[PDB]
Amino acid sequence: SLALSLTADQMVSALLDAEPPILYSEYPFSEASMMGLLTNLADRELVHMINWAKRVPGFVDLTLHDQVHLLECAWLEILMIGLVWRSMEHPGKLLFAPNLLLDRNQGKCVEGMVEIFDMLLATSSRFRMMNLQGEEFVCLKSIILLNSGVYTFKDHIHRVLDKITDTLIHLMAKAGLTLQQQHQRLAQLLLILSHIRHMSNKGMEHLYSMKCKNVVPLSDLLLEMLDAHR
Amino acid sequence: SLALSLTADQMVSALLDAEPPILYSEYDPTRPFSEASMMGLLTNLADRELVHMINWAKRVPGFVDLTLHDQVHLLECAWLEILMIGLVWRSMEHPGKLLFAPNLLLDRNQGKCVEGMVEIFDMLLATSSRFRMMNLQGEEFVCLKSIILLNSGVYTFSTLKSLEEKDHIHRVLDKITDTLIHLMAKAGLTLQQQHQRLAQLLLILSHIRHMSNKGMEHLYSMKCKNVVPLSDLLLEMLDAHR
Amino acid sequence: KILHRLLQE
Amino acid sequence: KILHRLLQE
Ligand SMILES: Oc1ccc(C(c2ccc(O)cc2)(C(F)(F)F)C(F)(F)F)cc1
Numbered sequence A: 001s002l003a004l005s006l007t008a009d010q011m012v013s014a015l016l017d018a019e020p021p022i023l024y025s026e027y028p029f030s031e032a033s034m035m036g037l038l039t040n041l042a043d044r045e046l047v048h049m050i051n052w053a054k055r056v057p058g059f060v061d062l063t064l065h066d067q068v069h070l071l072e073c074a075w076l077e078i079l080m081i082g083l084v085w086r087s088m089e090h091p092g093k094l095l096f097a098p099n100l101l102l103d104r105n106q107g108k109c110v111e112g113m114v115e116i117f118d119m120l121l122a123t124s125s126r127f128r129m130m131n132l133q134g135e136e137f138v139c140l141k142s143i144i145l146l147n148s149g150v151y152t153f154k155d156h157i158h159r160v161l162d163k164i165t166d167t168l169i170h171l172m173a174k175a176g177l178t179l180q181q182q183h184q185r186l187a188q189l190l191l192i193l194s195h196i197r198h199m200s201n202k203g204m205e206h207l208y209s210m211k212c213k214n215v216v217p218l219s220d221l222l223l224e225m226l227d228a229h230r
Numbered sequence B: 001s002l003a004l005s006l007t008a009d010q011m012v013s014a015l016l017d018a019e020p021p022i023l024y025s026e027y028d029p030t031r032p033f034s035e036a037s038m039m040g041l042l043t044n045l046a047d048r049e050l051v052h053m054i055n056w057a058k059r060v061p062g063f064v065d066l067t068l069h070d071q072v073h074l075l076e077c078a079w080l081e082i083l084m085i086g087l088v089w090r091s092m093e094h095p096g097k098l099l100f101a102p103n104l105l106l107d108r109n110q111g112k113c114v115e116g117m118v119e120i121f122d123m124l125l126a127t128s129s130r131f132r133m134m135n136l137q138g139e140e141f142v143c144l145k146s147i148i149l150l151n152s153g154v155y156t157f158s159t160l161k162s163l164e165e166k167d168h169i170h171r172v173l174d175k176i177t178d179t180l181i182h183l184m185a186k187a188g189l190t191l192q193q194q195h196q197r198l199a200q201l202l203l204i205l206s207h208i209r210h211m212s213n214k215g216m217e218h219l220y221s222m223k224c225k226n227v228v229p230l231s232d233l234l235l236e237m238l239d240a241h242r
Numbered sequence C, D: 001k002i003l004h005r006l007l008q009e
């Protein structure tokens, strides 16, 4: 397992490097047209996510079954944090794609949606005011992948998780933070992951309810990822 | 503010002091049980714990400084997480079993006896097992429990001023973080080890949030079934979610 | 509303 | 599962 022999610098660089691309939406809204765009986009993002995952140091050292488990548990969390990250510099807005930047009022066009929009926007504002950095962001995204499904199976994953922790503090020492600011920032960042998990859980219920309302058909892939949660 | 001024040690003393008691259930081992009845016993128990929890919350440094409105919100958001982490804590030294009460120690086989409850029991078991392997300490557990109360509802609270309500809470959380480091440094952990353990402890809060959400969905579902009756305070806490 | 009431004591 | 396929390239 190569992941453990990497340096902090190398880990960061590997992660920044595995970053998936920002996709475009198909070029006002109704429920059907809105959910159509979003689900089409989410399906494409998922394919790129799976590929990003294999590029996360340590991820591929797991059995296929474990890779499936981790991704099935964390997929929505990972989509959401990405969404929030790139929306960071668009206060009040959710940047789903460069050509699809939505605000809250556009969130009321889908039943049950505006509640989730609000949480997402809140997280974005929190990241913004924490001045979250790209290097920190990729570490967090990686932590979500390995952590979210781990207690529901391990030493390998915790070794790697520890390594990513080491990498986060490293980044902080660099920025010139004092020991006390370091452990305070680390905590602040990791506590937001709790809110991200909550948003995921709400989102999953919402998504399930929209499948039930047969508002739009979902891709087989998206339905498969959703189904792993009941 | 009294809270922002305590020392690590006074913080730990304060929380240890405010610990609610362990309650007994109406379980009668002479009586064999049904899925529904065992759910009645657990519901009655949680309802009584809730009352103790609310008065415990008042004793968590900084909580009393908030508006009644903010206090209500935090508890509505955190109540089941708090019940759950308390449950896993007292089940810690009983591998494979959940210690709901001193006279009520269940293994999963019996939890399967009710509908969709087994998935939650297994998650709860997993968490205890995790606590066990980390060798979680009592002073750490009380820190974690108060972090849950303060953190879980802080992003879902908002015209301008209430913005300062959020900043006070973040300052208190920072103090509790300092407290956890203090403890780990004391136990002779290297700097690297303190950071790693801090992360390990906080990541567990993600799984607890997950369990709570799953439990909430199971509770709302019990209700819709009118088999197991819920207490009034609890139907109320449930409703604050859906 | 029971919680509100208990918090006020 | 489609996920299985995708993960094995
Ligand atoms: O970056 C995305 C893309 C899609 C989504 C979805 C979503 C968006 C908002 C919700 O409240 C629920 C699901 C949507 F249904 F829109 F595709 C999903 F893929 F997660 F299902 C979330 C985040």
Ligand SMILES: Oc1ccc(C(c2ccc(O)cc2)(C(F)(F)F)C(F)(F)F)cc1
Pocket (backbone or CB within 6 Å): B039, B042, B043, B044, B045, B046, B049, B080, B083, B084, B086, B087, B100, B120, B215, B219
């Ligand atoms: O101290 C506790 C913790 C959890 C519970 C549970 C519970 C909570 C409310 C109920 O009405 C029934 C069970 C919950 F689902 F929350 F985890 C259970 F474990 F017993 F299932 C009861 C008491």
